[PDB]
Amino acid sequence: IDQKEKELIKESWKRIEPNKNEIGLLFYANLFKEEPTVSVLFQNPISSQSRKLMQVLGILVQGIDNLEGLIPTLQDLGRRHKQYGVVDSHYPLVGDCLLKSIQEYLGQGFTEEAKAAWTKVYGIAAQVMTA
Amino acid sequence: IDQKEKELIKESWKRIEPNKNEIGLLFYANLFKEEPTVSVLFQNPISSQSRKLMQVLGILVQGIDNLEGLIPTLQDLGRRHKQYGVVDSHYPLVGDCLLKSIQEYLGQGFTEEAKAAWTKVYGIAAQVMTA
Amino acid sequence: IDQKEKELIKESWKRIEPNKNEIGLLFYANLFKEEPTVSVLFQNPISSQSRKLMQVLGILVQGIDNLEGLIPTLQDLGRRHKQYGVVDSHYPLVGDCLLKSIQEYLGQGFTEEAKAAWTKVYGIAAQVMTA
Numbered sequence: 326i327d328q329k330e331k332e333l334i335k336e337s338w339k340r341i342e343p344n345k346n347e348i349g350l351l352f353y354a355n356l357f358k359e360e361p362t363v364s365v366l367f368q369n370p371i372s373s374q375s376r377k378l379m380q381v382l383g384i385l386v387q388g389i390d391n392l393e394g395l396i397p398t399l400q401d402l403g404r405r406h407k408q409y410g411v412v413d414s415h416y417p418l419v420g421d422c423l424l425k426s427i428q429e430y431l432g433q434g435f436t437e438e439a440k441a442a443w444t445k446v447y448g449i450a451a452q453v454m455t456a
Numbered sequence: 457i458d459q460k461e462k463e464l465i466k467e468s469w470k471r472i473e474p475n476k477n478e479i480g481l482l483f484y485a486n487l488f489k490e491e492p493t494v495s496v497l498f499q500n501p502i503s504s505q506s507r508k509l510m511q512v513l514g515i516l517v518q519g520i521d522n523l524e525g526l527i528p529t530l531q532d533l534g535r536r537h538k539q540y541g542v543v544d545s546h547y548p549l550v551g552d553c554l555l556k557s558i559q560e561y562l563g564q565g566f567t568e569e570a571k572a573a574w575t576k577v578y579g580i581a582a583q584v585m586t587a
Numbered sequence: 588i589d590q591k592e593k594e595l596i597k598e599s600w601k602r603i604e605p606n607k608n609e610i611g612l613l614f615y616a617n618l619f620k621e622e623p624t625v626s627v628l629f630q631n632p633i634s635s636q637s638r639k640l641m642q643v644l645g646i647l648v649q650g651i652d653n654l655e656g657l658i659p660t661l662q663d664l665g666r667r668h669k670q671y672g673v674v675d676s677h678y679p680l681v682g683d684c685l686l687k688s689i690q691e692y693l694g695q696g697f698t699e700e701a702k703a704a705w706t707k708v709y710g711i712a713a714q715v716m717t718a
């Protein structure tokens with residue numbers, strides 16, 4: 326992640342956070358439509374699972390300057406996700422799915438440049454989270 | 457549908473209306489979770505669909521003193537849903553899941569009475585759509 | 588926008604204008620300073636992205652007595668602006684910042700009465716552009 330990509334995450338988050346709720350939710354809907362089989366793993370109120378996903382993305386954004394500093398957490402999150410039955414192949418599909426939704430919801434307002442950046446960021450988080 | 461219960465819809469909508477977006481979105485996620493098979497029927501952007509869905513429930517509250525005056529829209533729609541491969545048996549499921557989605561997001565801000573009341577309304581608009 | 592203000596703008600503009608480049612640029616520089624992360628959003632050369640800023644400013648002055656006529660043009664602006672990744676909370680910066688830049692380069696040559704009149708006008712441009 327370079328400088329340009331850092332500044333990009335921060336600007337884009339100005340649009341995302343305000344609508345983060347909808348996106349989280351829109352995400353979940355699209356993920357359950359795309360791979361309807363994963364939905365069983367979600368055993369808690371979809372409403373409050375989304376507040377939790379968005380929260381980490383905010384965390385990522387608050388910490389985009391030094392992501393190393395995050396490794397400790399994402400690992401703990403990786404550990405917990407494995408308990409859920411989340412496995413490797415799931416990550417690409419969640420990555421693709423969240424983006425199409427952040428695109429979907431924000432439209433032309435989620436800029437090509439920005440999408441690229443988030444695609445890279447997710448990527449990392451994902452690696453890190455899959456020890 | 458009585459004037460007491462005609463009160464509660466006007467009342468709780470003022471609770472639903474401001475949250476329509478998240479509520480509409482969580483519904484589709486819950487739904488695609490509960491009855492996974494039916495997601496394949498929804499072939500349009502979930503975002504825009506939820507927008508379409510809430511607009512109608514608006515129209516519904518907007519006309520709750522005289523619903524007989526909507527039997528024509530409520531049937532133009534009945535025929536289009538038929539054209540969408542919706543069948544009668546879907547309405548109980550959706551309704552059920554809709555109402556449990558309005559309670560999820562609004563919590564203790566959506567009373568057993570508001571639930572009971574909407575329960576009927578959906579109940580009605582459906583039987584008119586199933587013509 | 589009372590008759591006084593309409594005149595106050597025409598005047599200060601007779602002063603901004605001869606120095607329109609110098610100012611245009613000072614502004615970006617002071618912008619990037621006040622806000623380290625906005626630079627990314629600017630993908631064209633600053634030397635010319637600034638020519639465009641000072642053009643619309645001219646257009647505004649060049650139309651002051653009638654902004655109703657300018658509401659079209661401006662709506663398109665804000666439209667393409669939203670797709671640059673620019674979100675509402677930027678405009679205050681860009682505002683505060685621009686004035687402070689015009690004032691920086693003119694010093695005393697820019698009346699306190701004119702500075703107020705530019706705030707209003709910039710203000711009005713925001714509303715109309717921010718939809």
Ligand code: HEM
Nearest residue numbers: 363366367368369377378381405409411415416419450451
């Ligand atoms: C970087 C990517 C991800 C982030 C930031 C994230 C975020 C979260 C968070 C914060 C939790 C809260 C529970 C906890 O404290 O561990 C959670 C739980 C969960 N996540 Fe993720 N997640 C990600 C990737 C995935 C993937 C790829 C899947 C696979 C479908 C997934 C599915 C789940 C499931 C099934 C739960 C448990 C649901 C329950 O509470 O029953 N997540 N996720």
Ligand code: HEM
Nearest residue numbers: 494497498499500508509512536540542546547550581582
């Ligand atoms: C009273 C209850 C319902 C209401 C108010 C409602 C609302 C709507 C609305 C407003 C549209 C707009 C598109 C149009 O018809 O012009 C629509 C289409 C549609 N509805 Fe419903 N709906 C209801 C029940 C159901 C049920 C039970 C199903 C079956 C699961 C369903 C599935 C669909 C589908 C699949 C479409 C087309 C989706 C697409 O765009 O591809 N709806 N509905």
Ligand code: HEM
Nearest residue numbers: 625628629630631639640643667671673677678681712713
């Ligand atoms: C009333 C205030 C503003 C005016 C009159 C204005 C004027 C312009 C004009 C004329 C353009 C040329 C692009 C086009 O014609 O579509 C432009 C582009 C642009 N403006 Fe503004 N602008 C204003 C406020 C802002 C604000 C608040 C931002 C936030 C950073 C901003 C950032 C940008 C960016 C990033 C571009 C495109 C740069 C590129 O990629 O080439 N502007 N602006």
